[PDB]
Subunit: 74 residues, 2 copies
């Protein structure tokens, strides 16, 4: 037990340290991923909102076209 009960101490220190480092790092990654997933959802919602505006404009242009067709028809 000359260095055996001494090296076991240095093992448990660095095992505790690795555990701490990897769990804190993982914690950061999950926070960052959840922030990413939230931004992505908001972005899909804003796209859908723009698309609805776009499709309504397409319909207005159809209507103006029809009025113009009546005007110019020979």
């Amino acid at each position: 037990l000359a260095a055996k009960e001494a090296k076991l101490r240095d093992l448990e220190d660095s095992l505790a340290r690795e555990r701490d480092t990897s769990r804190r790092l993982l914690a950061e990654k999950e926070r960052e991923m959840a922030e990413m997933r939230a931004r992505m959802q908001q972005q899909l919602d804003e796209y859908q909102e723009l698309l609805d505006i776009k499709l309504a404009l397409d319909m207005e242009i159809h209507a103006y076209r029809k009025l113009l067709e009546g005007e110019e028809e020979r």
Copy 2:
């Protein structure tokens, strides 16, 4: 060294195992995050593409308005 050179073996086994588990898990998280960042970029690009279409439609509607104003003006 009765159990001291024996428990040091069980320490290095589980330290090697923790290292392996956390590094493979981290690897997955980074792959997943990079996939997320790629989708987010594509999504911002598609939004910008829709917005440009939208703004062109706004201009066409302005133009049709002007034509209609000339038609109806008293």
